[PDB]
Amino acid sequence: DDDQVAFSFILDNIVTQKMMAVPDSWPFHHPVNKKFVPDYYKVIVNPMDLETIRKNISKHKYQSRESFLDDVNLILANSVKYNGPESQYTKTAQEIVNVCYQTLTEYDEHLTQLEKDICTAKEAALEEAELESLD
Numbered sequence: 001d002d003d004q005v006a007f008s009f010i011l012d013n014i015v016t017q018k019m020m021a022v023p024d025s026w027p028f029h030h031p032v033n034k035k036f037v038p039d040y041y042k043v044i045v046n047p048m049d050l051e052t053i054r055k056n057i058s059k060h061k062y063q064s065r066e067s068f069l070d071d072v073n074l075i076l077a078n079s080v081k082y083n084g085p086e087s088q089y090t091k092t093a094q095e096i097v098n099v100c101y102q103t104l105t106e107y108d109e110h111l112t113q114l115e116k117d118i119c120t121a122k123e124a125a126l127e128e129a130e131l132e133s134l135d
């Protein structure tokens, strides 16, 4: 609830202040424009980028670090597929993933608290929704 908002703020500041600050991270800031890279979506079936993650964050898509890190890792996997494992683009995506990991670790204790309280809050909301519906 209130905890979901704090969690999303932390994630968004990790994205804007750490991941987007990686040198030359511009290729991963926004979705690829088909008019500029015409092959991209023929190759990349589950696209992902830092802007889309911010929008998912603002929609409170992420209740835990795990689903957040699923999407962050999709950025890296897509660079590996389209650009190659040894490419400079993939080197940059890997740095983006590492700074994300590093920053989450700094805030592990606080983020673990939030995830716990977010989950117990969502269970309280779901359990009462079902009790209200049958009663």
Ligand SMILES: CSc1nc(N2CCOC[C@H]2C)cc(C2(S(=N)(N)=O)CC2)n1
Residues within 6 Å of the ligand: 026, 027, 028, 029, 030, 031, 032, 033, 034, 036, 037, 040, 079, 082, 083, 089
């Ligand atoms: C070479 S131009 C270009 N490349 C990009 N990447 C994506 C990562 O892999 C390599 C290459 C395909 C991404 C972009 C933009 S853009 N929206 N112009 O379309 C900002 C998103 N531009």
